Ligand binder design. Structure first.
Ligand SMILES: Nc1nc2c(ncn2[C@@H]2O[C@H](COP(=O)(O)OP(=O)(O)O)[C@@H](O)[C@H]2O)c(=O)[nH]1
Ligand SMILES: *S(=O)(=O)c1cccc(S(=O)(=O)Nc2ccccc2)c1
Ligand SMILES: [Mg+2]
Length: 167
């Protein structure tokens, strides 16, 4: 069946592991070693079609590793994640997006900007700010909460649909 290679990038602490574990396993994890990089798998149905998702959840110390580069080159779509309560993580988005364009040597790369931790009231990044950034990159912006599951499926399936159309 059709397989999709997705990569979740963003500053440490933004919820990459929580988002991926929520999608794959339907559990919210509040204590996941931030140094663990791992690939996750799940069969899902998207628009009536069964497909296999392969998802790389990234750890900071592997950023410039050869193995990370292999996964990035073969990756087909990228979630760029920040937390809506952490301005620094939002400021960092350009760094992750720049690395993707470099490794793929392309402007036409499926990506979604993800604003996570939407269930937290102490917001510091406005949705309008993130939509403007998303617009400037030509990508969708999806609000998520790994805790409540808000937008989790939407974020990953939107990326899959982007890849599906890109193919
Ligand atoms: N309230 C809330 N906490 C979250 C959310 N996503 C992640 N977290 C928490 O943020 C911390 C870091 O998340 P983690 O998945 O380890 O981030 P990573 O470093 O990007 O993998 C953990 O304490 C998680 O419980 C969310 O959507 N809502
Ligand atoms: S890894 O051990 O090279 C690995 C584990 C599971 C799946 C894959 S993959 O062939 O599907 N490549 C990939 C690339 C980007 C994001 C996820 C998976 C590789
Ligand atoms: Mg993690």
């Amino acid at each position: 069946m059709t397989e999709y290679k997705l990569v979740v990038v963003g500053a440490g602490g933004v919820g990459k592991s929580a988002l991926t574990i929520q999608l794959i396993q339907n559990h919210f994890v509040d204590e996941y070693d931030p140094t663990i990089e791992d690939s996750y798998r799940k069969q899902v149905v998207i628009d009536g079609e069964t497909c296999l998702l392969d998802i790389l959840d990234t750890a900071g110390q592997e950023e410039y590793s050869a193995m990370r580069d292999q996964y990035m080159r073969t990756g087909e779509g990228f979630l760029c994640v920040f937390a809506i309560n952490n301005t620094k993580s939002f400021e960092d988005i350009h760094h992750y997006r720049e690395q993707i364009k470099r490794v793929k040597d392309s402007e036409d790369v499926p990506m979604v900007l993800v604003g996570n931790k939407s269930d937290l009231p102490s917001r510091t990044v406005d949705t309008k700010q993130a939509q403007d950034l998303a617009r400037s990159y030509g990508i969708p912006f999806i609000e998520t909460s790994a805790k409540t599951r808000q937008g989790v499926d939407d974020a990953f399936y939107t990326l899959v649909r982007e890849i599906r159309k890109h193919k």
